[PDB]
Design a protein around this ligand. Structure first.
Ligand SMILES: CCCCCCCCCCCCCCCCCC(=O)OC[C@H](COP(=O)([O-])OCC(O)COP(=O)([O-])OC[C@@H](COC(=O)CCCCCCCCCCCCCCCCC)OC(=O)CCCCCCCCCCCCCCCCC)OC(=O)CCCCCCCCCCCCCCCCC
Ligand SMILES: CCCCCCCCCCCCCCCCCC(=O)OC[C@H](COP(=O)([O-])OCC(O)COP(=O)([O-])OC[C@@H](COC(=O)CCCCCCCCCCCCCCCCC)OC(=O)CCCCCCCCCCCCCCCCC)OC(=O)CCCCCCCCCCCCCCCCC
Ligand SMILES: CCCCCCCCCCCCCCCCC[C@@H](O)O[C@H](CO[C@H](O)CCCCCCCCCCCCCCC)COP(=O)(O)OCC[N+](C)(C)C
Ligand SMILES: CCCCCCCCCCCCCCCCC[C@@H](O)O[C@H](CO[C@H](O)CCCCCCCCCCCCCCC)COP(=O)(O)OCC[N+](C)(C)C
Ligand SMILES: CCCCCCCCCCCCCCCCC[C@@H](O)O[C@H](CO[C@H](O)CCCCCCCCCCCCCCC)COP(=O)(O)OCC[N+](C)(C)C
Ligand SMILES: CCCCCCCCCCCCCCCCC[C@@H](O)O[C@H](CO[C@H](O)CCCCCCCCCCCCCCC)COP(=O)(O)OCC[N+](C)(C)C
Ligand SMILES: CCCCCCCC/C=C\CCCCCCCC(=O)OC[C@H](COP(=O)(O)OCCN)OC(=O)CCCCCCC/C=C\CCCCCCCC
Ligand SMILES: CCCCCCCC/C=C\CCCCCCCC(=O)OC[C@H](COP(=O)(O)OCCN)OC(=O)CCCCCCC/C=C\CCCCCCCC
Ligand SMILES: CCCCCCCC/C=C\CCCCCCCC(=O)O[C@H](COC(=O)CCCCCCC/C=C/CCCCCCCC)COP(=O)(O)OCCN
Lengths: 122, 347, 53, 140, 104, 56, 55, 69, 459
């Protein structure tokens, strides 16, 4: 029920191991970052609407801070997420390699020699 | 209550929870639960009245019983292995006792009776605390000892929680009891996936806490605790009722809203472990929660109920106090489904 | 759920009291000190699943 | 216990219908006793003997349902020479539903219980045949 | 009061033709109404209907029906020019198939 | 003359601009799926004396 | 007979009636801790017997 | 119309080939990952599903006031 | 697919930043422009679908549905702006926003490459529709209608979610291309039977299948005019499209799992057509007619032949246009006399002649007069069903008769006879209403000239 908590050589509260730096960072126009910025913009607009201020005009410094905070946090969130998926794939490939008797390569047939069952539609 | 005393008590509640979360020794986890309860009883009675006294009394009795049971489980575990570290329980009987103690602390069915009464008896701020922060400690403990727990007892209590949350919520007109039954059903969802993937438990808990914080803050902003009192908010603050309508649909679990993500993730994980049947029941039963959310949205935002003459005076006054995190909470409660793969950062 | 602040900071807030084979006052041993020392050293670092078998 | 479920399922399907009926009656009686315990706890019966009467009513209804179900399903399986067939469990469950309806003396309850109990029992039989798991183990 | 509530009376609906005898039924403002009529008629009947129907009528033969007809013509010419069957009941070459060897 | 009529009719650029931006993003999406460009057994071809790619 | 009555009766009206009955059964508690606690005892006994004897 | 608004069939053809390769690789990767998770949870020999044991660094290996530990 | 999608999204802030008196003009103009751009998806390769990217693709099944959606949006705007005149600026913008979000969800659902994305968008369409019905619905009964529309739909779609995630766990993918190329037969087992049911029942309840159809008269009658238009024209077709996609992984089980659904659809065809003969409400009659038509589509999809799939596509498109036109025609009279009862206003041909012409043409396409595409679809389905079994002609023949009967009954009751003496507030037809009818009708007639466009992938 806890697959990656017990992995060896894992620092308790890093959020970003040093090994993560071997991975390409997300581009600054990453559509997920753009969506995080859009979330910040919606937060700014709802903020204006709740306090009965003009919705698109009232606080531009405030809306800018909303957008910037969301983009800033989202960048690091994306880094950590991509790093965790890289760990998953690394471990899966290493395990398949070290246990070849569990992942055998069997000879595959062309469809000319596989007998498939035919079911007429009528 | 002096403001400094209130701050000290909130800090003691939070520090008891953090003690439960950072400890490696069963005795320190028990001490964390004790400290949390000690500081939490006064926060329930902050606004003194007989109902708050009764709620704090029922809460204390339930939680202290759970505490005794928890300690007994720890001692039996020590008896069958000279161990104090919280890893995997050694004795099956100790594990049953521990599971039931933590279920009583969480309010899972059949131990669910206390949650609606205590929530109704206290203010909206104390209800917010009780239904968000008071879940972290037992859930973290359950996440640590997850391999040891028996699936049959856990899943029984989880399915009961979902069913009973739906059925009990169907009958309510008080908003605090609606929120409490909602919480019971949500806890059932969180604990159903626990023996399979604790990351799904954590994700469900985070999304539930976000939606519950948003709902409670919207209920405080429009100072309503009944259905008919919330039926007036349209004639003073229409934006609030529209935002509450959308938050209600997200709680229901309807796509493309965020509330749907936890349900979607949990069902998928379960199917991987060859468990088609439990999930089909869980979703078809969450339909009940969706029904009474929809009823509240009908009375509050989609139609207009009659109003009173004295509302005209309220039209002239702005809210004295504004919640800083309410806008962010609404956005995270509704518009976060496209960010689902970010759950990998939780493991 | 379990934030290991002790391991990150190297503190030992409660690890001194978790096992019977760990540094008692005046070197008084536990009744089952050798058996526990052996079981701990046998299962160290192999994980919970392998250690039980 | 689920030892009761095994004493039910250790008997083959279309064989020894009296023993299977006994086992199903035991299961039904246990269920009715638990139901009456919770009912007495959450809604007090105002006197000792009225609690005894409510217990007897609930337990007898449940044991009668179990007896009729097990008897009908085992007998239908052995007469039709058709084990491994959900129709026997459907017939048994519908008979048990009719028993519950005759007990509460309600035609609507009778018909509804016939239908839903029969469908549930047929589904349980299909799950036994195909290997469906209710409380699945954590495989992955 | 023998009443239940303070309520506005249900108003009668207003005829757009009363203040604007040629009102097109789009808006109360006669200018906005006229321009709504004009934009609807131009962008629906002139742009989408006529030009769109023309565009769809002259869509290139990407479905390859002319190509298929010419291909069938080549095949028929070659096949009955050589005395070969027009079509074979086997879609795929039987020499590229390896049936299971024994059938009993 | 054009100040306030721009200020009241500038909304008529949003949808055409979105159309142009969508065409651009479709081209960028095409630029990611070139692993088999001029590599299929049916359409593989010899490049002309001056062309660089068989499709863009 | 079919649209307005029986197709209504079987699927949606039955669902409403059943859920309404179960909601009334579940939510109508008298608020007495004696009764709630008594049930907790019943629950504890059941788990340690039909769940704790099974491993 | 074909010159102004569309392309040749080879572009769509080979884009489809690329799409199909990506999707089929993702499918086989998903199946392989499920199998790897099953094995790592059943055997405990993999990096995944590592449940904590007691740190051997806590043991005190000093004379213990009696010779037999 | 991005070129169609972004402008649709753009429509959102364009309407939120428009002047109070220009919202309808702006939305209508740019909706029509979007419809024109979409028109370019009808160019289809032949052998295979156009795959724009990993996420989106268009088919010959898909292209007709998208064009109908985009074309329906401006018509809904024309139909709405009359009864929404008294509304505040913010609420009018909210209504238009609901319609735009609905269009956006619909376009994405039809073009999503994989089933989980299709499921999410197919379910997301529920929220704007429910809000439209329950907030702008005229009657008290709208709240009940909303609940019926929601719950019937979710009770079908949640088992589909479970089935889909299970299928991706066992197969490794839900991408439709991989699903098609790696298809393997479904064995005959209880597990596979319930997988079939969980894959089929959501689309069955969307169609709707007879007996699970009770939500539709409620929801279609209690909705505002644009809600009814989109519910009949497009939202019913989600079930047909999804079924046509999903039945590729269900063979050969469909051979006998289809029997009860075929029986229900044929007999309920007869049943709903007969119901239309004794109906006192005029919207109720159009709703049940939609049910009868979709029963025919269900039969066509269940028998799984190329001719039946072609007929199903043609009938879906033709029904979408005709049913929307009939709802708009009924709404004009309702706007006049503020009642839905069919015998209240009579002899309207004497007072409104051009609207009577629109009524006649809509009634003629509803009964599938040759060579309209309604008859093309119906005839193709009837031929495929005849091949399936020669006895289907009796049921098919009976249905054709009852449809002619109630169509001409509606026409005769509302347009002919003498006018009710008391009603004196029947004003001349507005240019808006006549243009709305023409914009429904001209496209249908134009489609007869080029039948292959609406035929589908099998063609
Ligand atoms: C490590 C964890 C383990 C933890 C657990 C371990 C526990 C061990 C300790 C036990 C030793 C005793 C210690 C002292 C406890 C303090 C008692 C107390 O203070 O009472 C206060 C309490 C209230 O005090 P009060 O307010 O002053 O008095 C008001 C009147 O009492 C009421 O006023 P009224 O007259 O107006 O009300 C009517 C009357 C009405 O009372 C009734 O209606 C009861 C009549 C039902 C009769 C049952 C039918 C008989 C047949 C069943 C047999 C089953 C097998 C048969 C098989 C098939 C048969 C052919 O009373 C009630 O309604 C109250 C309900 C109380 C019923 C007893 C509670 C037990 C659970 C509920 C089950 C109900 C029976 C269903 C059957 C369940 C299975 C047996 O007193 C009582 O209610 C009863 C007296 C208590 C004496 C007996 C208590 C011992 C039972 C403890 C648990 C048993 C063992 C558990 C499992 C064992 C396996 C390991
Ligand atoms: C999707 C497209 C459309 C589909 C949807 C639409 C269709 C679906 C639903 C439509 C209606 C079906 C609902 C079933 C009826 C519900 C009963 C009810 O509501 O009770 C509440 C209602 C409330 O009553 P209450 O408040 O408790 O007490 C006051 C009573 O009113 C006071 O009552 P009372 O004192 O005046 O008399 C009551 C008493 C006596 O009742 C009377 O007084 C008059 C006698 C009535 C009985 C009629 C028997 C003689 C005629 C039967 C002909 C053979 C059957 C057809 C076979 C054709 C062969 C080719 O009743 C009995 O004890 C009857 C005893 C047993 C006879 C009926 C049971 C046999 C079941 C049939 C098995 C068929 C298997 C399949 C065959 C395969 C070949 C196709 O109870 C009644 O009043 C109804 C009593 C009559 C019920 C029996 C009639 C049922 C007819 C067949 C039902 C089976 C269809 C469902 C199939 C699924 C099964 C798994
Ligand atoms: C509704 C959306 C949910 C919102 C959630 C709140 C977001 C704001 C919270 C503030 C962010 C700061 C938190 C972390 C900062 C540094 C701390 C870091 O070191 O923590 C690490 C861990 O990192 C954090 O866990 C990651 C937090 C990221 C949460 C967001 C994911 C939401 C899922 C998808 C929804 C998309 C959300 C969009 C963002 C607004 C420690 O790792 P470890 O001690 O070994 O693990 C402890 C738990 N174990 C052992 C049981 C595994
Ligand atoms: C009121 C006064 C009435 C009296 C006046 C009457 C005036 C005369 C009216 C009768 C005109 C008859 C015209 C007959 C058709 C002639 C042209 C026809 O053949 O074009 C067809 C083509 O018609 C178009 O395909 C129609 C396409 C559909 C138009 C759609 C409009 C835009 C969409 C609007 C929304 C749609 C929503 C639903 C979408 C599914 C078929 O062409 P085809 O035989 O091949 O051409 C061969 C040579 N080509 C191919 C090179 C051209
Ligand atoms: C010659 C006269 C008789 C025959 C008439 C022929 C009818 C044809 C005219 C109909 C217009 C066709 C509808 C437009 C659909 C096409 C949309 C899209 O596919 O086109 C894009 C191209 O953009 C085009 O410009 C389409 C824009 C059309 C917009 C129509 C707006 C018309 C509104 C009229 C307003 C007039 C003034 C208003 C006064 C108030 C393609 O993107 P692209 O990335 O290239 O793709 C790569 C292909 N390459 C390689 C060939 C380049
Ligand atoms: C109102 C509109 C609602 C929507 C309509 C829903 C329609 C659902 C109906 C499903 C169609 C058929 C389901 C399964 C196909 C065959 C069913 C069964 O009766 O056939 C025999 C099955 O034998 C028996 O009949 C067993 C089933 C009997 C138990 C089921 C209870 C049926 C009672 C009717 C209840 C109504 C259900 C719908 C609720 C609304 C075949 O014999 P056998 O070859 O051995 O089994 C084939 C399966 N194998 C291969 C795995 C062995
Ligand atoms: C095992 C548990 C499975 C859980 C399945 C839950 C199904 C979800 C539907 C929830 C319906 C709840 C209805 C209810 O509780 O009350 C009925 C309600 C009470 O009215 P209130 O508004 O609460 O009060 C007004 C007076 N003050 O009465 C009504 O009129 C109901 C009207 C709307 C009912 C809609 C039902 C639609 C059901 C469609 C069919 C599928 C439903 C789900 C089950 C499918 C079958 C397996
Ligand atoms: C699945 C198991 C099948 C259980 C069969 C019983 C289901 C009956 C429901 C159909 C409706 C029949 C009916 O009449 O309901 C009434 C009946 C009560 O009797 P009345 O008719 O109201 O009394 C009449 C005089 N006042 O309703 C009930 O009390 C039972 C409702 C609960 C049904 C069981 C639901 C259990 C869900 C949890 C499963 C785990
Ligand atoms: C608005 C009304 C709509 C109502 C729709 C209800 C019917 C939906 C279809 C059935 C729903 C549940 C199907 C389960 C989802 C499919 C998952 C699957 O295929 O897994 C099966 C599992 O199959 C099941 O477990 C299904 C059993 C049924 C459990 C829930 C019963 C609910 C009622 C069933 C009958 C109703 C269905 C038709 C009703 C239509 C609506 C009237 C096989 O997997 P394994 O467990 O690994 O087996 C092989 C390895 N040993």
């Amino acid at each position: 029920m806890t697959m990656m908590s017990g992995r060896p050589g894992r620092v308790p509260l890093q959020f970003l191991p040093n090994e993560a730096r071997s991975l390409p960072p997300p581009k600054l126009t990453d559509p997920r970052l753009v969506y995080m910025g859009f979330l910040g913009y919606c937060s700014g607009l709802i903020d204006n609407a709740i306090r009965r201020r003009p919705v698109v005009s009232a606080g531009l410094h405030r809306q800018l801070l909303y957008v910037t905070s969301f983009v800033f946090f989202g960048y690091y969130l994306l880094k950590r997420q991509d790093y965790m998926y890289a760990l998953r794939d690394h471990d899966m490939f290493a395990y398949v390699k070290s246990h070849p008797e569990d992942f055998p390569e069997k000879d595959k047939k062309t469809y000319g020699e596989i007998l498939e069952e035919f079911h007429p539609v009528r | 209550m002096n403001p400094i005393i209130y701050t000290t008590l909130i800090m003691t509640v939070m520090s008891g929870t953090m003690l439960v979360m950072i400890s490696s020794h069963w005795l320190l986890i028990w001490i964390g639960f004790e400290m949390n309860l000690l500081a939490m009883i006064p926060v329930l009675m902050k606004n003194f009245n007989p109902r708050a006294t009764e709620a704090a009394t029922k809460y204390f009795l339930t939680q202290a019983t759970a505490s005794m049971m928890l300690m007994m489980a720890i001692i039996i575990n020590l008896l069958y292995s000279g161990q104090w570290t919280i890893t995997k329980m050694f004795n099956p009987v100790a594990m049953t006792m521990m599971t039931m103690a933590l279920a009583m602390k969480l309010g899972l069915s059949p131990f669910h009776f206390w949650v609606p009464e205590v929530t109704q008896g206290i203010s909206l701020q104390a209800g917010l605390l009780l239904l968000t922060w008071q879940k972290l400690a037992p859930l973290s403990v359950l996440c640590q000892i997850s391999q040891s727990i028996n699936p049959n007892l856990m899943l029984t209590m989880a399915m009961l929680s979902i069913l009973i949350g739906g059925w009990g919520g169907l009958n309510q007109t008080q908003l605090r009891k609606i929120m409490a039954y909602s919480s019971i059903a949500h806890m059932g969802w969180m604990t159903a996936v626990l023996p399979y993937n604790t990351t799904m438990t954590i994700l469900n808990l985070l999304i539930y806490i976000t939606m519950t914080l948003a709902m409670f803050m919207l209920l405080i902003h429009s100072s309503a605790t009944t259905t008919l009192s919330l039926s007036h908010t349209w004639n003073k603050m229409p934006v609030i009722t529209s935002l509450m309508m959308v938050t209600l649909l997200s709680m229901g679990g309807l796509p493309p809203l965020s509330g749907f993500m936890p349900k979607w993730m949990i069902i998928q994980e379960m199917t991987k472990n060859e468990s088609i049947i439990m999930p089909t029941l869980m979703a078809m039963t969450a339909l009940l929660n969706l029904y009474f959310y929809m009823r509240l949205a009908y009375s509050s935002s989609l139609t207009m109920f009659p109003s009173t003459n004295n509302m005209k005076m309220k039209w002239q006054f702005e809210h004295t106090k504004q919640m800083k995190l309410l806008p962010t909470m609404i956005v995270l409660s509704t518009l976060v489904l496209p960010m689902t793969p970010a759950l990998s950062s939780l493991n | 759920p379990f934030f290991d602040v002790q391991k990150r900071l190297g503190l030992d807030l409660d690890r001194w009291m978790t096992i019977q084979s760990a540094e008692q006052p005046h070197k008084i041993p536990g009744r089952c000190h050798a058996f526990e020392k052996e079981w701990i050293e046998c299962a160290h670092g192999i994980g919970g699943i392998r250690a039980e078998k | 216990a689920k030892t009761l479920l095994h004493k039910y399922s250790d008997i083959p399907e279309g064989t020894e219908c009296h023993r299977k009926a006994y086992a199903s009656t035991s299961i039904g009686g246990a269920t009715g006793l638990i139901v009456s315990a919770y009912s007495i706890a959450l809604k007090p019966p105002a006197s000792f003997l009225e609690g005894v009467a409510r217990t007897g009513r609930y337990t007898f209804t449940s044991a009668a349902i179990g007896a009729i179900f097990g008897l009908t399903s085992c007998i239908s399986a052995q007469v039709r020479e058709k084990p491994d067939d959900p129709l026997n469990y459907f017939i048994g469950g519908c008979a048990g539903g009719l028993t519950l309806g005759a007990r509460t003396r309600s035609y609507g309850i009778g018909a509804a219980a016939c239908a839903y109990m029969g469908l549930t029992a047929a589904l349980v039989k299909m799950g036994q045949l195909e290997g469906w798991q209710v409380f699945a183990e954590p495989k992955v | 009061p023998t009443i239940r509530l303070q309520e506005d009376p249900d108003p009668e609906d207003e005829n757009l033709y009363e203040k604007n005898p040629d009102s097109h039924g789009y808006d109360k403002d006669p200018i906005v109404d006229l321009w709504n009529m004009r934009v609807v008629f131009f962008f629906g009947f002139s742009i989408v209907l006529v030009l769109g129907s023309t565009f769809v009528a002259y869509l290139p033969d990407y479905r390859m029906q002319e190509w298929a007809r010419r291909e069938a013509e080549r095949l028929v010419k070659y096949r009955e020019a050589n005395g070969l069957p027009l079509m074979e009941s086997n879609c795929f070459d039987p020499n590229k198939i390896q049936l299971p060897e024994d059938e009993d | 003359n054009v100040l306030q009529i721009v200020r009241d009719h500038w909304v008529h650029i949003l949808v055409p601009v979105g159309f142009v931006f969508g065409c651009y993003l479709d081209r960028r999406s095409d630029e990611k799926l070139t692993a088999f460009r001029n590599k299929s057994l049916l359409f593989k071809r010899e490049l002309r004396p001056n062309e660089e790619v068989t499709w863009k | 007979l079919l649209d307005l009555i029986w197709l209504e009766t079987i699927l949606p009206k039955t669902t409403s009636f059943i859920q309404m009955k179960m909601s009334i059964m579940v939510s109508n508690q008298k608020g007495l801790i004696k009764l709630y606690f008594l049930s907790f005892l019943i629950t504890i006994m059941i788990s340690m017997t039909l769940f704790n004897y099974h491993e | 119309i074909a010159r102004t608004f569309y392309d040749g069939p080879e572009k769509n053809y080979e884009k489809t080939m690329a799409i199909l390769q990506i999707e089929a690789e993702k499918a086989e990767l998903r199946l392989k990952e499920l199998e790897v998770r099953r094995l790592m949870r059943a055997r405990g020999d993999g990096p995944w599903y590592q449940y904590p044991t007691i740190d051997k660094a806590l043991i005190d290996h000093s004379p213990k006031t009696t010779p037999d530990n | 697919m991005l070129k169609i999608i972004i402008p649709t999204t753009m429509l959102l802030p364009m309407t939120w930043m428009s002047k109070h008196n220009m919202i309808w003009i702006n939305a209508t103009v740019h909706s029509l422009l979007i419809s024109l751009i979409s028109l370019s998806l009808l160019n289809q390769l032949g052998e295979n679908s156009l795959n724009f990217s990993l996420t989106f693709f268009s088919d010959s099944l898909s292209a007709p549905l998208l064009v109908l959606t985009t074309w329906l949006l401006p018509l809904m705007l024309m139909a709405s702006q009359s009864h929404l005149s008294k509304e505040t600026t913010t609420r009018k913008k909210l209504y238009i926003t609901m319609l735009i979000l609905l269009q956006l969800f619909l376009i994405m659902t039809f073009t999503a490459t994989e089933l989980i994305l299709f499921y999410i968008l197919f379910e997301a369409t529920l929220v704007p529709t429910l809000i439209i019905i329950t907030r702008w619905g005229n009657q008290t009964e709208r709240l009940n209608a909303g609940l019926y529309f929601l719950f019937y739909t979710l009770a079908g779609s949640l088992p589909l979610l479970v089935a889909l995630v299970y299928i991706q766990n066992t197969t490794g993918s839900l991408n439709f291309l991989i699903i098609h190329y790696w298809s393997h037969p479904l064995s005959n087992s209880w597990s596979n039977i319930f997988m079939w049911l969980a894959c089929i029942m959501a689309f069955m309840v969307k169609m709707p299948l007879y007996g699970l159809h009770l939500w539709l008269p409620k929801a279609h009658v209690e909705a505002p005019i644009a809600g009814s238009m989109v519910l009949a024209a497009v939202l019913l077709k989600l079930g047909g499209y999804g079924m046509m996609r999903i039945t590729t992984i269900l063979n050969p089980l469909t051979n006998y799992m289809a029997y009860p659904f075929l029986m229900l659809s044929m007999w309920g065809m007869i049943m709903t057509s007969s119901i239309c003969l004794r109906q006192t409400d005029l919207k109720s009659l159009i709703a049940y007619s939609s049910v009868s038509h979709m029963a025919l589509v269900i039969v066509a999809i269940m028998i799984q032949t190329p001719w039946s799939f072609m007929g199903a596509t043609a009938l879906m498109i033709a029904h979408g246009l005709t049913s929307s036109m009939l709802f708009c025609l009924a709404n004009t009279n309702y706007e006049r006399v503020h009642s839905r009862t069919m015998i209240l206003a009579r002899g309207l041909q004497t007072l409104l002649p051009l609207m009577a012409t629109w009524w006649l043409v809509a009634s003629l396409t509803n009964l599938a007069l040759p060579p309209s595409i309604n008859l093309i679809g119906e005839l193709f389905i009837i031929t495929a069903s005849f091949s399936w079994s020669n006895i289907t002609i009796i049921l098919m023949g009976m249905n054709m008769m009852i449809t002619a009967l109630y169509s001409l009954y509606m026409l005769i009751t509302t347009q002919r006879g003498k006018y009710t003496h008391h009603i004196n507030n029947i004003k001349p037809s507005f240019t808006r209403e006549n243009a709305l009818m023409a914009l429904h009708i001209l496209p249908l007639l134009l489609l007869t000239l080029n039948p292959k466009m609406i035929l589908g992938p099998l063609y």
